[PDB]
């Protein structure tokens, strides 16, 4: 482990792992540190959806931000593989976000002013993917929102970060990061390094170093717990998503079955009125499913803030250390666009001033 | 392996696997025969409960032999450790049969007239068991109702069948069983033996064998999916029970909470409309399960049988052909007894004519 | 359950899942009887190379069978994708087998004349593999010897064979095959079945079936034990392959390890001396997998006959019965040849004579 | 999550748990702060050997205060299981620590002298434990160094101070010690407490606190390697030890195996070459464990301090602060000792000052 880097990256989940990634692109000498192993924690417990779509609300920054990153994942799988070995195994299905009520529909024919995203009636959907409830209005069908094992998906982006130099430290916690002198100063229980540049990106445990550094910028954790099972039975292509519950099934004849919404809870391990409640969500949207054997049951840590939206950016007061963290309930899907984003602030290049803006570290 | 044995056990769940350790304390040369590991199947998916009141219906034999059996589990575990080094884990909180109507309370009161089962009132429980549901019109305390770890029951019977003669051979199934010549002849993939007496102890799989001796003895197979989860907050001794489900303590932290009843399913894997339904029943029995962590899921096939009886005796048409399968819900509960009244068969001994009739293969 | 079939297939590995498939193709009222679950023995414990080079020692009938089945890989997973909707993750890296002495090289030199076959000097090997052995004399690059994941293949083939019709039936051990009337009649614990055509792909416990009909064929299991670890840190795209032991990595960033041979050894969990003893051969081939992370370990019976060659055809007293099985450590590599060539015997079309000559069923 | 405690707890392995169990003893408002899981680090990887004759190549203080915990375990299980409900699996099969070599009998002869502990001969070991190596030169008996399942007594110790009134948060990192008021100032994400009294028992991760509190004293971790196997055929009554090394009998029939030394390493998971090495030290100490079938493999980070001796006791500068952290090879053992002196002390008792000065904190 050297003693200096031009950057310094703490955390090793899917945020600070494309940042690493894209630095060492950069051919900046950079390194992480990673207090477990990397993706380790939320990152490996999502389902993988890039939802710009389906998690959409308003019209605002963010969501360009989301349908910028989408974009970014246009041909990622091949550039990472090629250099790591590792498939981040990508399933362009697509996504019915299903509607039971008027007020659903309502709700998703809002993109009707948007391209791959298109209204199908109960029976059209019936006629793609057959053992959809029934009892359906339709949904809206989102070609683009199509999904990724972030698992993979992380470790793919450090072991190409890895053979472009980056140098990755795992069970490595940063214990502070002292800005003081010209250079900034990390303290680890296996040493001390210096730097040009840091970048916080440890997930739902940002809060500490932003302290550290003066800022107040608070996150809370909302505990989220899901379950698989094996879908050997009947074809399901498309995701069904209603109501922030989905069933994405993965390439490998299982299906990602999840989401509970636990604020303030901190444990990582699922609850039995939990995964009962996931149970019963799961088979008003596929009846089926309650006959497929179930396979694993786990939870992580969504990073959540105060205004929903992510911290990335300078710190105010020192644009040495930078922020990423705080992806909600989109980590996986905004990576690409958010390592970008903060290579380009180190590098210093120019950047979309309203991005910028809107996740700026000093909000109101 | 030898060539020839005085008898031989075909199966090794807890009931073969308890006959073998009779028999070799009888001194007589015995061999065991499982097609997979010891108490590998059903055996290692049981509860545990000696449940010789909790599964009574009515006051036939049925329930005198288990009542006896339940008498034999005195001092067993002593025994069979000194020999084995294997704890069966017995835990002697007693069982709490909850009623939540009046119809329980009727069909609970008819134990009254027997010894350690005494009803408690609502208070009284709430009183033991704070956590039990307060939707409860009380319960039936049945002290006896203990349990055990089924799978270390086994293992401890086979351990010490070893330290006593009895040669067991695992991935060693039977293919068919000659009664021709003067002894019978057995075949395995792993070669052909001799034996004075063969006992067919291969729980639901045994028709193959009824059927090859000329018997149209059935078994139709019930399936039922656990789950465990880890209690680390509230007190519980003693076993929460209703209507055929349950909550047992473990010494270990640990709830096994179970069963569903899928009659002709075979498959062995829990499905998530099982578990759901085992989740949704435990928490009107212990709402406070809701918040605990879930452990493990599994599944086993109880044997089961035309008239919900074993079949526990010799071949109508040949004494030195034994049976002893079929014992649905109670092969735990039973095992001892089980084992002691077919080695009791095959040395000859005097044997209660009623239970030998109870149980014997030919029946209407 | 039906009550009569065109064609029933008796074992759900690799083998019987492409023959159901080619059968369901050939659009024939197809049944496949599983006694557990699909590809849960032999075939999910393979490495799933297609190692068509490791039967060349002779290029006989073997080595064109094995070529041509290695062959009709290309494309198959495409194939299935579009049906099954599972990857069977293909890693087209190719296989170095390593050389460790003179006379390795004398024995791998010979197939240069191959095509996609040749030879690699001790420093081309290091160019392209770094951290291979320092101590090899160089390798046999055998660019088509490439790898797949064996349940996901078999997973594959079953849920395509479902969508066209195949009737699948889990947890449903086929007792006895009759052969009386003008049909076969197969017996289950589930019911009985009628069939034009039967087909025994039981693999190692072929023999039961063998001997029912008549016929001697011996089956011995040779037990191999693996192992997986995490490869985070160094570049490997290629096999390493030594004497039948090897290192295979997958797209996941594993490494696939292994292989002892224990004949006889019906057990299907790895014991202590057989691990480390995979472990000290992997260290030889690849110094740096020492300080991987040991991920699982496992164990399968590969089917072996008196020749160690595959029985695949018709009963010589009776076409209407087929068997496919001992395919002793290439299984999976010749899993599409053996579906096509008994989909076809059954369909009665024209076939390589040779070929039928080579896997005759009464081989001297 | 209160605000203010009488005492508050940092660390919930078998140490800290020990500690807020005599603290809710000796009914103080006390409250313990747990990272993760309680535990779920170090505590629950290893052994549970009671190796109080492991530090007697010397008598000294640390000798006695070893004996002195070895005594508190007599009654230990008892007591908490009457509390808590849970079982810790002891043990007290005895030790044989194996001599293989003349140097080895002189070295474990020196302890002759010592009571319950005698030696046997070569051929006095194999009479008690005949699967022992036949390359010994005997070995010593210590009866008293006897087993328990680590995991399990932390838990009970856990439980058993909750039902006496303790606090216990798990995913609470305590993230800092703040000394400035009257009293301490702990804090952690899920808010911040004030107290009467610290005590720090993190193990190995302990060194951030005594360097935000003024102290130097550092720790490494000592990485341990260890496997299991199931032990289903030769009899095992008591522990084999030989070069630090183990094979200990648990009465689920499984052989716990091991340790490999492994300074400054922080990973959590076994890598290959460790393994390989355990197996092979297993192999020369009890020959037949390597027909045994493998159950699990796991390791932990021994808390090593500059000394190897633990530091517990009062900040040099503030005696509102304790540590008890830095058990390299006892900590288990250690536990009842350690949580008994910490607790006396914050009693303010009278104590043993020859301990006091064996665990101060600032050694020279
Ligand atoms: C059930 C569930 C389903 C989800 N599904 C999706 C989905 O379909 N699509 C999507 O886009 N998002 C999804 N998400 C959200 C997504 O998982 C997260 O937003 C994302 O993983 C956050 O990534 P991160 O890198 O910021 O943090 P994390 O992945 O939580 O990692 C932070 C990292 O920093 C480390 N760390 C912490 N403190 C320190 C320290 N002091 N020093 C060094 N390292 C430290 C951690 O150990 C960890 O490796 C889901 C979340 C949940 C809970
Ligand atoms: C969810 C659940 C909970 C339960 N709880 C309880 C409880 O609390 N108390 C209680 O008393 N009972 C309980 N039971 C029931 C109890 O598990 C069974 O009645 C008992 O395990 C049956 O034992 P067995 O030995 O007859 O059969 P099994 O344990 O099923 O074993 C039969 C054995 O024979 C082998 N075998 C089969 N065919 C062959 C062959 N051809 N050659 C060689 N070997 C062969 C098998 O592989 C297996 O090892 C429960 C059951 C379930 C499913
Ligand atoms: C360690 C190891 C590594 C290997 N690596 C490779 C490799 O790289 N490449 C390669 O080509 N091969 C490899 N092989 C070999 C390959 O795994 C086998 O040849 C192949 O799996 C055999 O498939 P099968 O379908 O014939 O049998 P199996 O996969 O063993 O399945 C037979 C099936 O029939 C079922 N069955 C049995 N009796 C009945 C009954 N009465 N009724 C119904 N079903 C029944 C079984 O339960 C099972 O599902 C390896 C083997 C091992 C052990
Ligand atoms: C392979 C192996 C075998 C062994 N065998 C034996 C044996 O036979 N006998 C014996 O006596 N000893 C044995 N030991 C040693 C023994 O395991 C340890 O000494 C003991 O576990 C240490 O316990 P602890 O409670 O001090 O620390 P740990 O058990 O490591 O726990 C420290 C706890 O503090 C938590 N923590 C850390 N930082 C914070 C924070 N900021 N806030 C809150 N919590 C925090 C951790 O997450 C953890 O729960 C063995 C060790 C190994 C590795
Ligand atoms: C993007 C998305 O839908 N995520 C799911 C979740 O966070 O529960
Ligand atoms: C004896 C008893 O209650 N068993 C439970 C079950 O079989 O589900
Ligand atoms: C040649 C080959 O693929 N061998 C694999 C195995 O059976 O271990
Ligand atoms: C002496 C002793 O118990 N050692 C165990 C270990 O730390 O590996």
Chains 1, 2, 3, 4 share one sequence.
Request: charged share 25%.
């Amino acid at each position: 482990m050297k003693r200096h880097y031009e950057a310094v990256v703490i955390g090793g989940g899917i945020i600070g792992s494309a940042i690493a990634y894209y630095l060492a692109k950069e051919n900046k000498n950079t390194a992480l540190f990673e207090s477990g192993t990397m993706g380790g924690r939320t990152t490996s417990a999502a389902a993988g959806m890039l939802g710009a779509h389906a998690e959409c609300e308003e019209r605002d920054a963010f969501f360009d931000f989301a349908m910028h990153s989408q974009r970014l994942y246009k041909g990622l799988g091949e550039e990472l593989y090629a250099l790591s070995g590792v498939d981040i195994r990508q399933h362009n299905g697509g996504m019915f976000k299903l509607a039971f009520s008027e007020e659903d529909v309502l709700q998703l024919r809002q993109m009707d002013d948007l391209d791959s995203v298109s209204w199908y009636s109960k029976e059209e959907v019936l006629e793609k993917e057959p053992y959809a409830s029934g009892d359906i209005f339709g949904a809206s069908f989102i070609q683009d929102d199509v999904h990724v094992e972030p698992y993979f998906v992380c470790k793919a982006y450090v072991k190409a970060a890895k053979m472009l130099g980056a140098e990755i430290f795992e069970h490595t916690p940063v214990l502070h990061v002292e800005r003081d002198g010209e250079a900034l100063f990390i303290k680890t229980p296996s040493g001390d390094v210096w730097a040009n540049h840091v970048v916080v990106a440890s997930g739902v445990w940002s809060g500490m170093f932003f302290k550290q550094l003066g800022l107040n910028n608070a996150f809370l954790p909302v505990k989220g717990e899901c379950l698989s099972v094996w879908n050997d039975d009947i074809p399901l292509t498309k995701t069904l998503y209603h109501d922030h519950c989905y069933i994405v099934p993965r390439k490998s004849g299982r299906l990602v079955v999840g989401a509970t919404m636990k604020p303030g809870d901190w444990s990582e391990t699922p609850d039995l009125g939990g995964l009962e409640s996931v149970m019963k969500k799961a088979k008003t949207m596929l009846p089926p499913i309650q006959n497929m054997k179930v396979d694993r049951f786990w939870a992580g840590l969504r990073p959540g803030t105060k205004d929903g939206k992510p911290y990335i950016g300078r710190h105010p007061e020192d644009s040495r250390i930078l922020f990423a963290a705080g992806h909600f309930r989109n980590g996986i899907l905004l990576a690409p666009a958010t390592g970008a984003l903060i290579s380009d602030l180190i590098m210093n290049k120019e950047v979309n001033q309203d991005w910028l803006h809107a996740f700026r570290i000093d909000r109101k």
